[PDB]
Amino acid sequence: PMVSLAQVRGALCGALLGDCMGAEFEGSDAVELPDVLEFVRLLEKEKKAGTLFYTDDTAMTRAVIQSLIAKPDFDEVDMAKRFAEEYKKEPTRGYGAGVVQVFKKLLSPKYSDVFQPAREQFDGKGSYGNGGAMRVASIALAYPNIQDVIKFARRSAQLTHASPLGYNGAILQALAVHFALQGELKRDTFLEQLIGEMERIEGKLPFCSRLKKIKEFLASSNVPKADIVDELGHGIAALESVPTAIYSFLHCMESDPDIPDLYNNLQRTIIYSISLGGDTDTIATMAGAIAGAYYGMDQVTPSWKRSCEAIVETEESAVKLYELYCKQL
Ligand SMILES: Nc1ncnc2c1ncn2[C@@H]1O[C@H](COP(=O)(O)OP(=O)(O)OC[C@H]2NC[C@H](O)[C@@H]2O)[C@@H](O)[C@H]1O
Ligand SMILES: [Mg+2]
Ligand SMILES: [Mg+2]
Numbered sequence: 001p002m003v004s005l006a007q008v009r010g011a012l013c014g015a016l017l018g019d020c021m022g023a024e025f026e027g028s029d030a031v032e033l034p035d036v037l038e039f040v041r042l043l044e045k046e047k048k049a050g051t052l053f054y055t056d057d058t059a060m061t062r063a064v065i066q067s068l069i070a071k072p073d074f075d076e077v078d079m080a081k082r083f084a085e086e087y088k089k090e091p092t093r094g095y096g097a098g099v100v101q102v103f104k105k106l107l108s109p110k111y112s113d114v115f116q117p118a119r120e121q122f123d124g125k126g127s128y129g130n131g132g133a134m135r136v137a138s139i140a141l142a143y144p145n146i147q148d149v150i151k152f153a154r155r156s157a158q159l160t161h162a163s164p165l166g167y168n169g170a171i172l173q174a175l176a177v178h179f180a181l182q183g184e185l186k187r188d189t190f191l192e193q194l195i196g197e198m199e200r201i202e203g204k205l206p207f208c209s210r211l212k213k214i215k216e217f218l219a220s221s222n223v224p225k226a227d228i229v230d231e232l233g234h235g236i237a238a239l240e241s242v243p244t245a246i247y248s249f250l251h252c253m254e255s256d257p258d259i260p261d262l263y264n265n266l267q268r269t270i271i272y273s274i275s276l277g278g279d280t281d282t283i284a285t286m287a288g289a290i291a292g293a294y295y296g297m298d299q300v301t302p303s304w305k306r307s308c309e310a311i312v313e314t315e316e317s318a319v320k321l322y323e324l325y326c327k328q329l
Contacts (some may be wrong), residue, residue, distance in 0.1 A: 001182075005318065007181055007294075008325065009297045010295060011141055011180075011290075012315075012317060012318045015057075015061060015285050015292065018270055018283075018285035018289070019057040019058045020052035020054050021039070021040075021270055022274050022285060023094070023281040025039075025274055025277070026279070029234070029278055031275055031276070031280065032275075033258055033275040036275050037260075040271065040304075043303075044303040050308070050309055051307055052309060053309045054093070055094040056093040059086050059087075060131070061134075061135045061138060061285075062086070063082040063135075064079065064082075064136070064138045072142070074155070076159060083159060083160070085107075087103035088107060096129050096131055096236065098127050099129070101117070102160050105120070118162040122163075125163055127162065127166050129237060130237065130279065131166075132156070132160060132170035133157070133170045133286060136156060136173050136174045137173065137177045139156060140178040141322075141324075141325060142321055144182075150171055150201065154167050154170065166238050168206075169238025169242045170238070171201060172194065172243075173245070173246075173286055176246050180291070187253055191250065195212070206239050210232055211246070213231050214247050222257075228247060229278070232244040234280075241278075241279055241283050245284075246286075246287075246290065248273040252269040252272050252287075256272060258275075266291045266295045267301070269287050270287065270291075273288070
């Protein structure tokens, strides 16, 4: 039953792998599995370590983690500051065009309410992008109690994503990591857990409807990529990416006929995610966090992880997150 350091480290390294490997295909909407498999074989043979750079997905993840470690009770003012200073330090990591404005406003002296800049986005409608969700995994790694996971997922997201689609996408991604982490649930129970929580939270019900489609897809075999993309999405919008990440994870619990069986489940998850195209760094970073939490560090292979920028720092950070988790027990 008990959550291991291997699982927490697995989640963070999974997220990092997904971001670093997915970034290599970002925004190319048609990705063919053969290119992904070619990329992985080349990657495994690279003599130099650290050839793949992380993006805003990981930059913001690291800022979430530093906030949780500094303020374990969750301090949204501290976290807002870390987001804004990280942006300022490394503004070219690949941030969305909208969210840049949130950081500039948080960096100015005009706002005392750290949630107000996010509220003002897109004529006061707020962002429905997946940026809240891309960084949220660590909430589930720090807070064992589901009510904490839900409220802190929401609040962390609302620093940049004030639209319900934005922040509910973050909650869903946090819940997926939460349920992956706490046991090795069977597929059907995992989805039931998520659908149950999102029905309460949303309750026409956009995320629930996608989770229902996922249930249907998993009851079929040989579902073409095109049907997954058409019905779930591969977009920058949280609605069109978070369920897709969850599907990738659940799908890759079993053999995929197109992916050689010599790849483990976590590797398969990342390969499959990227093969869906679109927002590949974010979909893979989210699917990789879930898979990492589920399968743990045993499936984070040396040849894959050595390729990623900040792998050592990431592995270290897991220990400090794990301490947060254990204190909360
Ligand atoms: N309400 C609304 N209306 C119209 N367009 C929107 C809206 N919300 C988001 N968007 C579009 O989504 C884009 C991204 O949203 P934003 O809030 O700027 O960024 P995120 O943090 O969600 O983006 C995360 C993504 N960017 C790089 C990352 O790896 C993720 O793919 C933004 O520039 C717009 O084109
Ligand atoms: Mg990115
Ligand atoms: Mg992205």
